[PDB]
Design a binder for this molecule. Sequence first.
Ligand SMILES: Nc1ncnc2c1ncn2[C@@H]1O[C@H](COP(=O)(O)OP(=O)(O)OP(=O)(O)O)[C@@H](O)[C@H]1O
Ligand SMILES: Nc1ncnc2c1ncn2[C@@H]1O[C@H](COP(=O)(O)OP(=O)(O)OP(=O)(O)O)[C@@H](O)[C@H]1O
Ligand SMILES: Nc1ncnc2c1ncn2[C@@H]1O[C@H](COP(=O)(O)OP(=O)(O)OP(=O)(O)O)[C@@H](O)[C@H]1O
Lengths: 376, 375, 372, 368, 376
Amino acid sequence: MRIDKLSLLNFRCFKQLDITFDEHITILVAPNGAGKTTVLDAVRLALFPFIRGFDASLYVKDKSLAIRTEDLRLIYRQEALNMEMSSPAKITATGEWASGKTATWMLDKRGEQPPHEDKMAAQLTRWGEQLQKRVREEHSLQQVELPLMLYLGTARLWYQEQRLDNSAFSRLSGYDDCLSATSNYKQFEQWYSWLWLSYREHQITQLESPSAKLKEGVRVQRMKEAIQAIQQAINCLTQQVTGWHDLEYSASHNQQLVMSHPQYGKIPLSQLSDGLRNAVAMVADIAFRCVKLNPHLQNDAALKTQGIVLIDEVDMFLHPAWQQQIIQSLRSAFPQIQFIVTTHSPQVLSTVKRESIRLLEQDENGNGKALMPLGA
Amino acid sequence: MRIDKLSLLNFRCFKQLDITFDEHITILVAPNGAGKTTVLDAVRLALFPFIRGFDASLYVKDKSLAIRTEDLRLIYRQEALNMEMSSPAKITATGEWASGKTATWMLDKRGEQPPHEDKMAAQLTRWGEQLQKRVREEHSLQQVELPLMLYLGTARLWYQERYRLDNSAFSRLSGYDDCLSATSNYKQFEQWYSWLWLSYREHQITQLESPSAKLKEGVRVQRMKEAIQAIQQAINCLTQQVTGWHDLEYSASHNQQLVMSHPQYGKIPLSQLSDGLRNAVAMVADIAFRCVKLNPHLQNDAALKTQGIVLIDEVDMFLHPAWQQQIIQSLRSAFPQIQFIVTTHSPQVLSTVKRESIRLLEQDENGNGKALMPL
Amino acid sequence: MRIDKLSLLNFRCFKQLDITFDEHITILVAPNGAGKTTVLDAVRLALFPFIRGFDASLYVKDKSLAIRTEDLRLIYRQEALNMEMSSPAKITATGEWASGKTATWMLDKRGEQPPHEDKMAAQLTRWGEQLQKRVREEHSLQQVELPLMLYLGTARLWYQERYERLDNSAFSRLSGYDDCLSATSNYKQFEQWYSWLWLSYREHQITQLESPSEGVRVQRMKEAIQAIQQAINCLTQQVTGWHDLEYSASHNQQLVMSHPQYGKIPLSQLSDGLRNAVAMVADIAFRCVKLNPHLQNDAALKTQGIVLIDEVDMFLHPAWQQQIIQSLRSAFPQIQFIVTTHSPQVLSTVKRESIRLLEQDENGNGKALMPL
Amino acid sequence: MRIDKLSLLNFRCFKQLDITFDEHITILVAPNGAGKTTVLDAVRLALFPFIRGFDASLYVKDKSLAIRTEDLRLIYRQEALNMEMSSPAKITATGEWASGKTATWMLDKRGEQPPHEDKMAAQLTRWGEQLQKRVREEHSLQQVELPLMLYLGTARLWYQRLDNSAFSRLSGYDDCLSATSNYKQFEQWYSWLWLSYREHQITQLESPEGVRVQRMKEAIQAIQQAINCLTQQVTGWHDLEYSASHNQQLVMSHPQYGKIPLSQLSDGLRNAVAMVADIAFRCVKLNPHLQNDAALKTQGIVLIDEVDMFLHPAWQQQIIQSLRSAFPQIQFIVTTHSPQVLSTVKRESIRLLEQDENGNGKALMPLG
Amino acid sequence: MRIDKLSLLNFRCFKQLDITFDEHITILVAPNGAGKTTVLDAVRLALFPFIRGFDASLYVKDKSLAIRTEDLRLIYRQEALNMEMSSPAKITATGEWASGKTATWMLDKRGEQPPHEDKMAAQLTRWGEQLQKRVREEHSLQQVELPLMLYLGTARLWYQEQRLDNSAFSRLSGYDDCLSATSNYKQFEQWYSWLWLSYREHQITQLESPSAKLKEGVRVQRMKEAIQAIQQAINCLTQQVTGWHDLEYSASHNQQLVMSHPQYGKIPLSQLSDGLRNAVAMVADIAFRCVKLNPHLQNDAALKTQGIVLIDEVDMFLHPAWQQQIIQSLRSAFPQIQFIVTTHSPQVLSTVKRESIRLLEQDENGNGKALMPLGA
Ligand SMILES: Nc1ncnc2c1ncn2[C@@H]1O[C@H](COP(=O)(O)OP(=O)(O)OP(=O)(O)O)[C@@H](O)[C@H]1O
Ligand SMILES: Nc1ncnc2c1ncn2[C@@H]1O[C@H](COP(=O)(O)OP(=O)(O)OP(=O)(O)O)[C@@H](O)[C@H]1O
Ligand SMILES: Nc1ncnc2c1ncn2[C@@H]1O[C@H](COP(=O)(O)OP(=O)(O)OP(=O)(O)O)[C@@H](O)[C@H]1O
């Protein structure tokens, strides 16, 4: 979808806040205190209505996706013995789903009562259910494109039957743990290893019975093109600056992924630099979701998929020459996704214009301002 | 807040009952199987709607706070050797909420259908919600006075061998936690009192270290000291004269326990004391700390300037007659602005009590009840 | 068994105390802070070894059955504003176990060292082991008579909404010693045993009615039910009106009582006094029935032992208070009672030879004396 | 203890490298793939034998404690399309172990054969065994000064008594090469220690034996001094405390703004405080026979990877000086890739890493 | 070891029992009741002192290898309301170990008290500890022969790293769950598959690269002889009556165990008859323990290992022609193992002498007698 602005009232550290988001790229910088995680959590809480209408609900018991009592402001006064909650907590998300309509959905919590949603949240989850039911039917000539809602946190490296063909499954499995705060690298390695081995098996079998090629070769073709897509995205980060390219799988290396370099050969990914692993994990996380969601594009799963992706500390483990080429490379790899990223490195801030910078300042009473730089 | 009259219809052992309360103290005197706990439960059920408007009532797990099928009167027909269930069971209560506002509200239950209430109970709930909103408001000029509601039944007893803070324990509304429930609330008092004492000692040590911070920093020390003295005075007023023990405090030497002092004896933990003193201290503390927590802007008159209704069942238990002759006066002197409704079956409590506070309960063969002043 | 004299040295509030008990009933009358629960705890600690000789004492989770450092006397030195712990704490008990056998046994604790006991304390454990061995024998011509020991403290109370498939050990005689000298409530055991009895009796009733003519077990069950019912009637009927305690399936499988004017009501819907009195009497009655099954009709009327009751007049109005001692003596004629109270109404019709006023001096010297 | 030179032959990425360390501080400044973690890992492996003689490393099964097959260099041919697995992996470390006790030790790995070392490594291991036996004596007037060895990597951010006993002394070397330092455990044990100290203070205050009191008091003093060295310069905050009055929280003091909670600070500063506090606590535990200058008078080697992790550029100009001043006897080896760290450091401690087209690495200093 | 007598007092259903065991084979027959399981459990409880001296028992902590309170005798009388518990319960076992050391140990329980043991039980545990410490050495030239204690129950078909070389491990791992009542066929198939794959890989790297023929032949010979011993033990039951023989591992059938028949070929084991599967499981369960315990024999791991084995319902799922050949084939497969087996069928009873049959009968009071038949 898309988001235009977000308003916060009586949240964790903000008494009130109004923030505006850019069309393509926006960067949040806060010199002191928290506040970046607060805004990212607010945006993450404003999109759970969509994913809830996709069989993802309290079965996993992910209690972090609803406003909690610990998320309400609690003021301490030195001259009094009591400590009173400030009620109610309110998130007002303004967005745009399909070109033409502007929506404004609100999520509020009052004290210890269960959280409450407005009519627009119900409308949004009904839209999610509508897309699910439209996908699940196969007796249609016109296919549909799903949006991508992904959240990447600072815990994305802590603890580092597969299918691809069009169906109700393998098109809704890309929403599994999309907004979770844990790592999801094992899933990528399993899926990629399965895809590579099955592609090798299919290309071996192709030489046996060419008669059914009209029904078989296309399979291989699909299982080829997808790979290319993924690889292309990864290259856009790892080749011009570092030199590594063409992520591959080979059982000859004790069945683990490898990467290629012009001069240092083919080396396992498990014993490379930290920044390369970070970039590979991020771009892989975006890409394999993009290719599972829209197998029907088969070459523009990364160049036509639309959605919203959240990143915390995008410049983690990278050197300045790399930090001067991360934003443009992310834009080139995925040109149709809106990004909300949080940084603090002065190098990254010099690769973007003044319209994509938001300085968050907080007063003593909690009032917050999301300003833009004065000079240019 | 005040309650003035009460009516019961087909509630337990009473086919019909009308009872009138006094402004300050009312004592119900009757033998076993007369209906005192019945009246106390009726008052609890009448007053619950006010508490239902607060966020502290969402954790109540007491099943006795709604009218039940076991509460419907059963009539024994001897010829058929049968018991017939009479319906409906109804409660009516007249009272005053704010200045110059009289009201009457009703509760009912028929058969096995869920209980029902009229509009006035909903208005109590809305009044409670309004007060809760007023308390939680920042930058308020006028002050807010919260009332006190408590029920001290037979589950308050401290028998042999019967016995960090959450962010909600520091709120005013925490004075309404388990207020009208049939449970024991000594652990909450213990935790809060220990926290006050630890904070006060921390400030004392800090002041003793550097004598250069006694400017705008000593307000919190003063507030805590005043809360401590209020609770201590309230507890002393019941025990000191007849028993000698006073000054309930917190001691780290005695394995971090609550201790009390005697002139002839020494200083002993509360859990090692007599049953009567132990129960009396628990009973008085249950009111004192709630009074301190609810209204923090009085700061030394929380016990002496709080209004509300407090219910006590079997007030003279574990106390010898010499102690029984002083309890009503001690409670009236400690908490002078609280309407007390108490029940007893001992002539010693009524030793020095006016005849305008005693209600004898009588019943006829058909179940018609009477609550009358003594002649 | 029987206890005749007791001595306390450096216990909680007594530097020294010597107390003599009566054969049948003895009442301790004193205000608060006088040492009645102190004497009851002393007697409980003295009597523990006999139970410690039984296999039913392995599941005891009570920390109050051993002398603790909190029981050592503390002397307040005013000049130094100090508390001094005086040692040692001793408990001496004189009594009789079997015919023509007088004994005296002592318990001690010094400092923070573990408590100690003498040889005469171990002989009680050995006698308990011997009795247990004689109860678990097949083809024994001689009968075995077991004594009853019970403690009914302040933890027995049935307050508002307390609401406290049998194991194979619940059918043994020795199960009469489960949590006997512990500060706990034992109402669930009585409820389960009584419900099982009533269900079995009804099963036999329908079985007999189906095919008119096995005949002995029905008689045993009927006799046990009659004994328990009579024991409760001896206290509840005359003053209040509720007599028969029965199991009812029509009332959602609950225990019910009946009244001449009112109807039939569950026990958990009655007054506090009724609940407490019924629990107190039943706790003795069903243990009497279980311990000695060979009497079969006089288990309550022919059982010997010691029963300790604290605050016997709780939740009872003066008219009921005037008759508790007589009711207990009429229900259980052969049991030695030691009870504590501070009400002048319980002593209304009691001989002066059963009253022990407790007093103490400024130095802690205690006296338990007859009135006048 | 001190390391003076490291030499590597046929390592992960270096065909031959010779680096000279400094007495106090050294920074390896290089972009990605230039071999900064490799140097730290080599130093870490060189120090394994000393720890190995403590009967505590046999429980954990970690493959990184010895050279593996993945360590051996691989050469690319570009014509045969094959990777040549070179051999042997060589590690040479020279230094001082005591007052005028110089030594030079070596670790080797040939092919798939298990790694083996010279008997000077056994000499170091038996020196460690001698130390652990000597400290275990229950009656000895002589004072033993144990050193500090710690490795804080990029995995550090994710998951009882202070008596003069052998268990307390040997608890310092627990997980000394796989240390973790986040905020949760730090606040937990700091709060426990402060609660015990406040209990003893209140006991003394109420009624006017001291063995366990002074230890806690001066451990508090040491930790407070270290954190103050970290924070009191740039900001006025100092004297981290646990306040039960202030909603039972860890609070800091500022002469103008009063008291502020520690939960209002950013994650980076909290993690830096936790790192400094953990190092100071290990220093206090290891050498109790000073009780207040343990952090200021203990020698050893501490290895930190990516010291500029999650730090605002304003706090990247004071980390090195703060670490130097809070521990003026420890030898530090840290790896950075940010110029803001180097804005106040002298030239002598900077070791830029270069590598030719073959793998002939160099560790040099800026020319000026 | 060996057992020559067993006495039971106040156990589950026997008030008093005295039973004598034969040197090689003994059969227990009971027309009614559950005495056979009682006697087998008594024998199983009298051998746990030996196994308790091995640390490998730490893997199992079931509360079933000690005398429970439910194992005592409860007396129900129809004329009384009380039900009492007969105490004490005693298991007296008379046996021989060390080939000449006669002993008589006793286990007892008194009511709810914890179980008690005599000096001889401690001696047996100490002898187990001595054997463990003597095995844990490696440089010693003289080799130790361990005994086997195995129990097979009726639940041995329900539930349906690796090393072999001489060491402290792989010689004590054969005692893992030796007296448990849960099936352990998975832990046999895993070990057998590992052994077969390793042997095949050694053979492949042998003939493919003759230069690596220096000293790897000894491992190949040891593994070959282990396979041969297991196969012969299984053949001694299967071949003569059913025709199947020479079980094999082959990945050509989806990595599954296979068996061979001259007139039907090679078939996966999971699809044969029930009786053949039962026999394979039993003989495998004996065999791989016999070969892991004593690799040093390396030719007669089955023909020279001594011990005691208990079988419940030995004739399960077998037809009458197979029930006249089970006892003799068990004896031939393992000639030096004492067997205590329980059965019903009259066909098995005709293949053994009159001196190896025990008939258990109970009186009304519980007194038990173990008679011998008069006829043939
Ligand atoms: N559902 C019912 N229908 C009719 N009578 C009932 C019912 N439930 C209880 N009763 C009777 O009503 C009386 C209840 O009296 P209650 O115990 O409340 O008063 P009390 O004697 O003053 O006791 P307390 O000490 O608890 O105040 C008892 O006689 C009881 O048997
Ligand atoms: N360890 C101790 N040292 C000194 N004095 C103690 C100690 N423990 C308790 N005391 C005091 O001695 C008193 C003993 O009286 P106790 O409460 O046992 O009897 P009682 O007043 O008759 O109570 P009850 O209602 O239980 O019969 C305690 O109330 C307390 O004041
Ligand atoms: N086994 C190996 N054989 C050959 N080259 C290797 C091997 N393992 C790693 N490398 C190469 O060595 C380099 C790894 O450098 P290193 O791991 O020291 O990282 P770094 O750039 O110093 O940063 P960081 O501290 O973040 O890890 C990469 O160029 C990698 O391709």
